[PDB]
Write a protein that binds this ligand. Structure first.
Ligand code: SF4
Length: 83
């Protein structure tokens, strides 16, 4: 069950970025974002994931203020976690 503040499929920015809380149900292959092969990309290894926000599998994303993403998710702004 998603948290009350989870990013939802109906969120305009989620639609624009093609977010899904399950990266296996994402278009990461089509997007081919750089830094890792697409099959390896999900929120947990993204620079925008905020490890100190949320709990468990539901963590912050800088791009979605006030909400939570799933660590196993993906969107088209995926960027390698470099620091
Ligand atoms: S920017 Fe990164 S952490 Fe945020 S939803 Fe997209 S892939 Fe997940």
């Amino acid at each position: 069950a998603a948290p009350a503040n989870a990013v939802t499929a109906d969120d305009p920015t989620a639609i624009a970025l093609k977010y899904n809380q399950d990266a296996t149900k994402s278009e990461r292959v089509a997007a081919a974002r750089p830094g890792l092969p697409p099959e390896e990309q999900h929120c947990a290894n993204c620079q925008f994931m905020q490890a100190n926000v949320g709990e468990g599998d539901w963590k912050g994303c800088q791009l979605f203020p006030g909400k939570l993403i799933n660590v196993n998710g993906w969107c088209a702004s995926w960027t390698l976690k470099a620091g």
